[PDB]
Each structure stands twice: as C-alpha cells, then as structure tokens.
Amino acid sequence: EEKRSSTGFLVKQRAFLKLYMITMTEQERLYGLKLLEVLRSEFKEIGFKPNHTEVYRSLHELLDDGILKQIKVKKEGAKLQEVVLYQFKDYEAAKLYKKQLKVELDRCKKLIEKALSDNF
C-alpha cells in the first residue's frame, strides 16, 4: 500500500519510455533528433530495442499534455536545421507521472517474480 494506483497487468512500452524521457530531461540530456539513438543505446545490453514509432509518440504526448516544451536554436552551418533541447513546462505533472509509475513498476516486479516461482 501507499497511494493506490495498483491494479492491472504490466506496463506499456510508451509508458516505459515516457519515464526515461522525464528523467533524461531532469539531467538536461533530452535532445531532439539524437533521442532514438540514445534510447536504443540504453537497452542494447538487456535486448530491448525501442520501437521507432513508440518513441516519437511518447514524446509528442509529453509535449501535448504540457509536461515538456522545446527550446529550439537555428543551426548556423545549415539552413532549415535547428538544435532541439527539451525542458519542463510542468515539472509537478512530470513529478506526478514518475510517482504513479513507481507503483506500476513495483507491481510488475511482483508479477514476474510470482510467475517465475509458480511455474519452475
């Protein structure tokens, strides 16, 4: 127990990816195109390859829900190009999502641990 939120199966890829993107913004390291390559490089060891569309999708929802905003700066040696940094518009809302996602994760952990002990 803690604050409810705890019912369901596991977590969706999109919800998984949003969590990492929130933390990456806290560390000042969520840059636009550059993101899919840093996200895939993060899970290569475990064998997870983030889906191209789930990545682009999670990001737009974080923008459209008003948690992130984008800092754009025109690239000097390139017409029609811009460096994109992501920052918080609503850090409290981001802080909520992270809180609510720990409860999903601890339940996932217990579910997988249950399945492993019951079946083998």
Binding residues for a second copy, per CB under 8 A?
6-11, 13, 16, 19-20, 22-23, 43, 46-49, 98, 101-102, 105-116, 118-120
- Cβ density class 70-80: b for 16+ within 10 Å, e for less: eeeeeeeeeee
Side chain identity, residue 100: Q
> Minimum distance from CB of 68 to a second copy (Å)?
16
The C-alpha atoms of residue 26 and residue 28 are separated, in whole angstroms, by 6
> Minimum distance from CB of 89 to a second copy (Å)?
20
The C-alpha atoms of residue 32 and residue 48 are separated, in whole angstroms, by 21
Nearest to 33 by CA among 10, 56, 14, 62: 56
Residue 43 or 56 having the CB closest to a second copy: 43
Residue 53 or 81 having the CB closest to a second copy: 53
Residue 41 or 81 having the CB closest to a second copy: 41
> Minimum distance from CB of 42 to a second copy (Å)?
8
The C-alpha atoms of residue 72 and residue 7 are separated, in whole angstroms, by 40
> Minimum distance from CB of 61 to a second copy (Å)?
18
